[PDB]
Each structure stands twice: as structure tokens, then as C-alpha cells.
Write a protein that binds this DNA or RNA. Structure first.
Length: 81
DNA sequence: GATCTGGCCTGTCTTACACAGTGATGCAAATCAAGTGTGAAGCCAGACAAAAACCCG
């Protein structure tokens, strides 16, 4: 009810229960059973309102499996060679 | 007896059998560290007007 960095996982849960309600219903009725992409783009927009295309591109990269992730074939290459 | 020949003995000669990987130095290239005011690529403005993909008489 006060802040969120100190509010725990379920404290935040009870804080935005109704946020979750609306977002899940709208998502799984509009995108035909999906919440990942809609919450993804929601956070992208709500952070890009502060024109932080650096973090936007970084998050789109981690969603695209390229950057600070080392896809398992790469780590396997390193362990072998 | 005298010699022939065949067997064994070395004796050379042929191909082959394990070196790139270690930690160190040492130069060349990159960057980067400030200065300070720029413009440029998007941001987003609620609301409005020309195209691709597919429904529809």
C-alpha cells in the first residue's frame, strides 16, 4: 500500500491483486490465451515512457535470447574446447 | 675326395613409432578521459487519413 521495493513478493501480490485480475482477463480474452507478450509490452511501454531505449533493447534482447545469456550450445562449446 | 648346395647369421634397407603447448615479454592499436554546446533519432500528443490481409454480398 506504501511502496514496492521493500514490499515482498506476496505483499506486492496483495497490493496489485486487482491489477493482476484486469490484466489477466483482458489478456487471455484478447490475445487468445496469453499473458507473457502483453505483460512484456506493458512493461516495455511503462518503462519507455522514460525514453530508456537502452534498457528496452536490453530486455528485448534477453527476450530474444541474445546477451549475457550464453545459450546452452555456447556453454557446451566452451566446456568442450 | 671335391664340390655343390642349403641352412643360419648377420647386415643393410624399407616403412613405420611420441612438438605444439607453457607462461612470460613486448610493442601496435584502441579508447577514453575530460572538457560544453549542439542537433538527430525517436517519444508521445487524441484524433485523422491512405494501404496489406482477408470477409463477404
Amino acid at each position: 500500500r506504501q511502496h514496492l521495493l521493500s514490499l515482498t513478493r506476496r505483499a506486492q501480490k496483495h497490493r496489485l491483486r486487482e491489477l493482476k485480475i484486469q490484466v489477466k482477463e483482458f489478456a487471455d480474452k484478447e490475445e487468445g490465451g496469453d499473458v507473457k507478450a502483453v505483460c512484456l509490452t506493458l512493461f516495455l511501454l511503462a518503462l519507455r515512457a522514460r525514453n530508456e531505449h537502452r534498457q528496452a533493447d536490453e530486455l528485448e534482447a534477453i527476450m530474444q535470447g541474445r546477451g549475457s545469456g550464453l545459450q546452452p550450445a555456447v556453454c557446451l562449446a566452451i566446456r568442450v574446447n
